[PDB]
Amino acid sequence: VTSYTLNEVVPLKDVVPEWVRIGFSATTGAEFAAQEVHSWSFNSQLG
Amino acid sequence: VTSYTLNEVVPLKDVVPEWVRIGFSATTGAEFAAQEVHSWSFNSQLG
Amino acid sequence: TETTSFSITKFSPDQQNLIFQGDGYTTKGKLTLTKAVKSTVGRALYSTPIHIWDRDTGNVANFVTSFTFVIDAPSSYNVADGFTFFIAPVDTKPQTGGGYLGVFNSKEYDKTSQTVAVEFDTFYNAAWDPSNKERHIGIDVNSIKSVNTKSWNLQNGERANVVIAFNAATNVLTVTLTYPN
Amino acid sequence: TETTSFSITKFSPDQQNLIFQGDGYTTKGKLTLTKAVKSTVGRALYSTPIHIWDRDTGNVANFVTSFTFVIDAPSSYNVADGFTFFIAPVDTKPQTGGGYLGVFNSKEYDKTSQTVAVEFDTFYNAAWDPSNKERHIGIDVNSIKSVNTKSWNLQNGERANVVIAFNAATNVLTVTLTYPN
Ligand SMILES: [Ca+2]
Ligand SMILES: [Ca+2]
Ligand SMILES: [Mn+2]
Ligand SMILES: [Mn+2]
């Protein structure tokens, strides 16, 4: 198994609005590739 | 503590579409009352 | 596999994940469907569409919902029409008000309705409510005339906890209503 | 208190709880953001707005997301532009394409962007990517220029497992990507 980990402090309250939408993006240019997602889980708790 | 329980067989697949919305409704007529909900939790699992 | 869960223990004035119809609105940490006013209707829908069954596999979802509600009427002899928990198509709009509870339009079986509702009926409508004239909890399938009802004694202003469960292996829909006292 | 949770282990051809933008579509159990075609963009959003912080209490949500993705390119020296997981305002629409990943419009900090993205950048844009020209994972806040990056060796066609967690107590966003071999 090979893994990579990165961490950063991000003050969410100051960057995003109270309600948001979460999602995925992908683009290609003159060089390209296919980008697929096979599965997705998500859990949030406010309060 | 007073409780009430009702059971019935309902063949969901034959009455509602594959995708649905869940919610609450309330009405008043010549006679009325206030209707309100204080908390709401839901869990479903397909397959 | 596909699952979905949510829990709201207190409503925001700007509850973005809900769709409001009629007089429904959020106030003081609570969801108000109707205020104590005549001839009105209010509905609130969770905005995510839920995947209930899969045409492809024939699978049907297992699900459970829990909620706390209150009915506050002027008196035990002046209360109408009732409140429901319902499952309907994604573009559902309020239907006939009054004794139809904002969800059905007839006591006759309307296959185009595609709605299942669990009602807490506080007013007796002679045309389709149980003969005994008692308030009751009922399971509604495409029609305002319940397929099964259970007599229930309304406790005015009191908080009732309700649990509604559907067991897909069985097709059984169970409803439990409880009062502290 | 509010909680939200969802799991999708296989995508339906009619995934009504997702919003698709650009070429995003579902097919064969999978969500395709882009095909291996030149100059294109695709996005897929979960449709329910998520309540991330509260005005009132000043509370901030703890959250965790996990997903499996694959990037399939013609070869190791022909791959662009990349993929991201992002958090944006509810009304978000695709922004600039190519090196901007469909989520940003500039390498300068843009407060009005209000978008945080975790990128998996496969193509070196000289105007703002790390000087080493290596492919990398990065944390982006209102800009295409990451605040922090980590070199990453793309395994062409391999399924990567990613976990992205946010700890409201420390404001620390953590990203972990794992490959089987
Ligand atoms: Ca009635
Ligand atoms: Ca790049
Ligand atoms: Mn009835
Ligand atoms: Mn980059």
XYZ file of C-alpha atoms and ligand atoms in Angstrom:
460
model
C 0.000 0.000 0.000
C 1.230 3.598 -0.838
C -0.260 6.671 0.853
C 0.077 10.432 1.006
C -1.139 12.757 3.774
C -1.341 16.527 3.808
C -2.772 18.839 6.527
C -3.435 22.613 6.690
C -5.305 24.883 9.009
C -8.317 26.291 7.125
C -10.668 28.716 9.003
C -13.860 27.570 7.294
C -16.082 30.121 9.081
C -14.223 32.914 7.448
C -14.038 31.480 3.914
C -17.359 29.749 3.092
C -20.979 30.771 3.705
C -23.088 29.066 6.401
C -24.744 26.736 3.881
C -22.719 25.182 1.088
C -22.851 22.603 -1.638
C -20.045 19.913 -1.818
C -19.010 18.184 -5.055
C -16.272 17.144 -7.493
C -14.655 18.871 -10.489
C -12.377 17.705 -13.245
C -11.077 19.281 -16.469
C -8.814 18.360 -19.430
C -6.857 20.711 -21.738
C -4.769 19.848 -24.840
C -3.473 16.906 -22.724
C -6.402 14.853 -21.220
C -7.625 11.897 -19.149
C -10.873 10.337 -17.939
C -11.853 11.209 -14.357
C -14.273 8.920 -12.515
C -15.595 8.435 -9.038
C -16.604 4.984 -7.977
C -18.060 5.571 -4.467
C -18.700 8.489 -2.020
C -19.618 8.656 1.751
C -20.073 11.877 3.753
C -20.932 12.682 7.374
C -21.202 16.162 8.984
C -22.398 17.242 12.421
C -23.112 20.924 13.375
C -23.594 21.453 17.237
C -46.531 7.044 29.623
C -49.258 6.431 26.983
C -48.420 4.679 23.688
C -50.289 3.633 20.499
C -49.069 1.316 17.711
C -50.577 0.554 14.294
C -49.179 -1.970 11.671
C -50.184 -2.566 8.074
C -48.615 -4.202 5.033
C -47.966 -1.495 2.346
C -46.404 -2.586 -1.027
C -44.275 0.556 -1.510
C -42.805 -0.500 -4.826
C -46.248 -0.624 -6.332
C -47.496 2.730 -5.017
C -44.558 5.225 -5.057
C -41.977 6.112 -7.707
C -38.359 4.975 -7.314
C -37.435 8.454 -6.108
C -39.590 10.372 -3.634
C -39.598 13.323 -1.218
C -40.648 12.901 2.500
C -42.335 15.632 4.529
C -45.115 16.789 6.866
C -48.493 18.282 6.078
C -51.117 19.929 8.291
C -54.401 21.757 7.665
C -57.204 23.542 9.605
C -60.776 24.188 8.522
C -63.609 26.013 10.341
C -62.129 24.314 13.447
C -58.348 24.712 13.866
C -55.184 24.295 15.876
C -51.449 24.975 15.614
C -49.307 22.119 14.340
C -45.615 22.077 14.797
C -42.607 19.704 14.819
C -39.783 19.981 17.297
C -37.202 17.525 15.987
C -36.871 15.150 13.001
C -34.492 12.295 12.253
C -34.476 9.873 9.246
C -32.441 6.901 8.002
C -32.923 4.763 4.868
C -30.829 2.118 3.195
C -31.318 0.601 -0.282
C -29.341 -2.620 -0.965
C -25.790 0.294 -1.696
C -27.095 3.743 -1.010
C -27.855 5.219 2.404
C -29.123 8.525 3.698
C -29.460 9.938 7.300
C -30.241 13.261 8.867
C -31.172 14.636 12.217
C -32.421 18.086 13.070
C -32.897 18.751 16.769
C -33.601 22.359 16.170
C -34.800 24.399 13.243
C -32.963 27.416 11.839
C -34.880 30.427 10.492
C -33.118 29.763 7.229
C -33.393 26.019 7.065
C -31.917 25.573 3.532
C -32.326 21.784 3.383
C -36.171 22.015 3.597
C -38.822 23.046 1.042
C -41.786 25.007 2.514
C -45.264 25.043 0.969
C -48.451 26.717 2.217
C -47.858 28.430 5.619
C -45.048 26.226 6.631
C -42.138 28.099 8.179
C -39.457 27.819 10.840
C -39.669 29.804 14.048
C -37.937 29.634 17.388
C -36.062 26.399 16.841
C -39.387 24.898 15.619
C -41.158 24.028 12.407
C -44.722 25.501 12.215
C -47.017 23.852 9.600
C -50.069 25.885 10.652
C -50.724 28.484 13.226
C -54.086 28.332 15.138
C -55.938 29.966 12.205
C -58.891 28.833 10.095
C -58.835 27.160 6.708
C -55.123 27.044 6.052
C -52.452 24.507 4.951
C -48.737 24.195 5.443
C -46.241 21.498 4.336
C -42.459 21.087 4.743
C -40.414 18.674 2.642
C -36.858 17.456 3.160
C -35.163 18.716 0.016
C -32.985 15.654 -0.970
C -34.825 13.146 -3.199
C -34.631 9.681 -1.564
C -34.007 6.435 -3.476
C -36.868 4.236 -2.205
C -36.706 1.244 -4.570
C -34.558 0.258 -7.547
C -36.377 -0.825 -10.751
C -33.190 -2.642 -11.841
C -32.761 -4.857 -8.873
C -36.287 -4.905 -7.421
C -34.730 -3.818 -4.080
C -36.835 -1.723 -1.732
C -35.349 0.423 1.033
C -35.608 -0.170 4.766
C -36.145 3.203 6.584
C -37.101 4.705 9.938
C -38.140 8.194 10.918
C -38.551 9.685 14.387
C -40.106 13.088 15.236
C -41.635 15.154 17.995
C -44.789 17.117 17.382
C -47.358 19.180 19.089
C -50.962 19.954 18.349
C -52.143 23.106 20.259
C -55.901 23.717 19.909
C -58.205 26.231 21.635
C -59.996 23.327 23.362
C -60.532 19.595 23.092
C -63.884 20.273 21.380
C -62.441 22.722 18.853
C -59.680 21.018 16.875
C -59.203 20.167 13.167
C -58.023 18.781 10.734
C -54.872 16.950 11.524
C -51.228 16.419 10.650
C -49.412 13.789 8.468
C -46.009 12.318 7.702
C -46.061 11.399 3.965
C -43.999 9.904 1.073
C -44.747 11.241 -2.389
C -43.209 11.872 -5.789
C -40.360 14.392 -5.997
C -42.402 17.258 -7.537
C -45.288 16.983 -4.999
C -47.359 20.138 -4.504
C -50.000 20.669 -1.743
C -53.245 18.843 -2.653
C -56.764 19.510 -1.276
C -56.835 21.128 2.145
C -59.207 20.646 5.009
C -60.167 17.058 5.791
C -57.950 15.985 2.805
C -54.945 17.087 4.878
C -53.097 18.777 1.911
C -52.095 15.317 0.535
C -55.076 13.622 -1.253
C -58.036 14.811 -3.321
C -60.579 12.019 -2.900
C -61.710 9.110 -0.701
C -61.619 6.994 -3.832
C -58.400 5.146 -4.711
C -56.380 7.393 -7.008
C -53.496 5.485 -8.471
C -52.060 8.757 -9.889
C -51.569 10.142 -6.368
C -48.598 7.819 -5.692
C -48.635 8.957 -2.051
C -48.519 7.067 1.186
C -49.333 9.098 4.362
C -49.483 8.370 8.121
C -52.175 10.667 9.495
C -53.031 11.903 12.987
C -56.641 12.914 12.278
C -58.275 15.122 14.878
C -61.605 15.839 13.108
C -64.288 13.364 12.071
C -65.339 13.623 8.425
C -68.495 11.498 8.080
C -67.773 10.625 4.430
C -64.728 8.448 5.138
C -63.538 8.567 8.798
C -64.190 5.684 11.182
C -67.860 5.569 12.324
C -66.897 5.699 15.987
C -66.087 9.460 15.426
C -62.931 9.143 17.538
C -59.652 10.844 16.696
C -57.212 8.411 15.277
C -53.891 7.488 13.726
C -54.364 6.003 10.183
C -52.248 4.543 7.319
C -53.310 6.165 3.967
C -52.449 4.789 0.524
C -53.552 6.883 -2.493
C -56.739 7.974 -0.658
C -57.992 9.952 2.403
C -59.924 6.877 3.579
C -57.383 4.974 5.707
C -56.632 1.251 5.076
C -56.108 0.741 8.823
C -56.853 3.096 11.761
C -56.246 3.067 15.527
C -58.212 5.241 17.991
C -56.056 7.852 19.642
C -56.740 10.298 22.466
C -55.327 13.674 21.629
C -53.388 15.196 24.551
C -53.729 18.961 23.825
C -50.416 20.958 23.884
C -48.460 17.907 24.773
C -45.390 16.670 22.943
C -45.729 13.294 21.270
C -42.765 11.288 20.103
C -43.472 9.276 16.922
C -41.423 6.512 15.312
C -42.427 5.243 11.780
C -40.506 2.198 10.414
C -40.746 0.247 7.136
C -39.355 -3.282 6.928
C -38.730 -4.021 3.253
C -38.378 -7.809 3.710
C -41.962 -7.751 5.003
C -43.638 -4.642 3.511
C -44.847 -3.863 6.957
C -45.159 -0.125 7.872
C -45.224 0.317 11.740
C -46.238 3.469 13.581
C -45.765 4.131 17.304
C -46.949 7.335 19.053
C -45.908 7.972 22.681
C -46.751 10.544 25.309
C -44.641 11.095 28.498
C -47.859 10.989 30.554
C -27.838 20.052 16.404
C -27.945 18.866 12.845
C -26.255 15.889 11.223
C -26.208 14.677 7.595
C -24.798 11.458 6.249
C -24.888 9.612 2.937
C -23.228 6.732 1.168
C -23.240 5.817 -2.489
C -21.376 2.595 -3.412
C -22.734 2.427 -6.905
C -24.153 5.222 -9.126
C -27.503 4.952 -10.855
C -28.050 6.246 -14.410
C -30.642 8.553 -12.838
C -29.022 9.795 -9.766
C -31.619 12.380 -8.760
C -29.794 13.419 -5.609
C -26.795 14.779 -7.640
C -26.529 17.956 -9.736
C -24.434 17.587 -12.908
C -22.593 20.412 -14.635
C -20.523 20.313 -17.848
C -20.014 16.677 -19.076
C -20.536 15.044 -15.699
C -22.881 12.004 -16.048
C -23.404 8.565 -14.427
C -22.725 5.386 -16.323
C -22.070 1.795 -15.434
C -22.224 2.267 -11.696
C -19.751 5.096 -11.967
C -19.729 8.846 -11.955
C -17.777 10.225 -14.973
C -16.628 13.861 -14.659
C -14.707 13.802 -17.937
C -14.080 11.401 -20.680
C -10.527 11.351 -22.094
C -11.339 14.163 -24.516
C -9.556 17.551 -25.019
C -10.472 20.825 -23.319
C -13.535 19.714 -21.351
C -15.001 20.182 -17.853
C -17.417 18.216 -15.704
C -18.800 18.730 -12.201
C -21.187 16.808 -9.908
C -22.632 18.302 -6.745
C -24.582 16.507 -3.929
C -27.949 18.327 -4.210
C -28.726 19.029 -0.514
C -27.267 22.182 0.979
C -25.098 21.339 3.946
C -25.148 23.482 7.090
C -21.431 24.027 7.733
C -21.304 26.800 10.370
C -23.980 28.658 12.355
C -24.225 32.474 12.398
C -25.717 32.482 15.864
C -23.755 30.030 17.894
C -20.606 30.585 15.815
C -20.366 26.788 15.793
C -18.600 24.999 12.980
C -19.326 21.492 11.749
C -16.955 18.566 12.003
C -17.118 16.543 8.730
C -15.512 13.613 6.961
C -15.781 12.490 3.326
C -14.437 9.417 1.646
C -14.389 8.466 -2.018
C -12.736 6.269 -4.607
C -11.513 7.739 -7.898
C -9.490 6.770 -10.887
C -7.743 8.886 -13.432
C -7.287 7.035 -16.796
C -4.856 8.769 -19.178
C -3.352 7.681 -22.507
C 0.099 7.516 -20.897
C 2.224 8.908 -18.113
C 3.454 11.876 -20.170
C 0.012 12.859 -21.551
C -2.294 13.689 -18.599
C -4.129 16.946 -17.658
C -5.553 18.817 -15.798
C -6.751 17.234 -12.636
C -9.564 16.483 -10.266
C -10.903 18.170 -7.081
C -13.261 17.676 -4.117
C -14.704 21.193 -3.280
C -16.945 23.175 -0.910
C -18.685 26.196 -2.403
C -21.708 28.440 -2.105
C -25.044 26.692 -2.897
C -25.446 28.455 -6.250
C -21.996 27.429 -7.548
C -21.598 27.110 -11.281
C -18.457 25.970 -13.228
C -15.698 28.591 -13.183
C -12.685 28.628 -15.549
C -11.594 25.346 -17.134
C -8.204 23.752 -17.905
C -5.611 24.494 -15.174
C -8.283 26.307 -13.057
C -10.036 22.979 -12.573
C -13.567 24.344 -13.191
C -13.509 25.838 -9.636
C -11.340 29.078 -9.645
C -10.658 32.021 -11.941
C -7.294 33.331 -10.775
C -4.063 32.594 -8.941
C -4.667 35.714 -6.804
C -6.653 35.356 -3.562
C -10.340 36.064 -4.341
C -12.484 36.560 -1.200
C -15.664 36.488 -3.275
C -14.807 32.962 -4.501
C -15.745 31.477 -1.088
C -14.612 28.077 -2.252
C -12.203 25.626 -0.616
C -10.912 22.798 -2.891
C -8.679 19.745 -2.364
C -6.930 19.235 -5.761
C -5.276 16.219 -7.403
C -3.278 18.129 -9.978
C -1.751 16.151 -12.795
C -0.387 19.002 -15.005
C 2.223 21.626 -14.225
C 0.919 25.187 -14.922
C 4.033 27.363 -14.733
C 2.075 30.421 -13.580
C 1.344 28.988 -10.092
C 2.144 25.213 -9.558
C 5.132 24.065 -7.465
C 8.431 24.721 -9.270
C 9.431 21.082 -9.101
C 6.818 20.342 -11.829
C 5.746 17.259 -9.901
C 2.095 16.162 -9.890
C 0.686 16.887 -6.443
C -2.136 17.013 -3.942
C -2.942 20.589 -2.799
C -5.250 22.579 -0.466
C -6.779 25.609 -2.243
C -8.588 28.496 -0.550
C -10.129 31.132 -2.831
C -7.289 30.623 -5.400
C -5.779 28.064 -7.838
C -2.434 28.686 -6.127
C -2.496 26.106 -3.215
C -1.693 27.130 0.361
C 0.042 23.682 0.835
C 0.946 20.918 -1.615
C 2.443 17.396 -1.409
C 4.150 15.561 -4.306
C 2.139 12.653 -5.486
C 2.971 9.911 -8.009
C -0.094 9.229 -10.105
C -0.747 5.505 -10.657
C -2.430 5.591 -14.098
C -5.767 3.688 -14.092
C -5.536 2.677 -10.385
C -8.299 3.230 -7.860
C -7.164 5.706 -5.171
C -9.016 5.786 -1.854
C -9.288 9.296 -0.337
C -10.410 10.435 3.095
C -10.878 14.208 3.734
C -11.667 15.198 7.369
C -12.258 18.585 8.982
C -11.805 19.010 12.804
C -13.779 22.092 13.895
C -11.862 22.174 17.188
C -8.484 22.814 15.517
C -9.678 24.106 12.083
C -7.351 21.446 10.646
C -8.381 19.950 7.237
C -6.550 16.564 6.624
C -6.294 14.675 3.342
C -5.120 11.150 2.934
C -4.822 9.318 -0.441
C -4.044 5.610 -0.552
C -3.230 3.156 -3.399
C -3.365 -0.733 -2.855
C 0.208 -1.225 -4.092
Ca -60.693 13.702 9.404
Ca -1.977 22.320 -12.618
Mn -58.978 9.846 9.013
Mn -1.672 22.796 -8.445
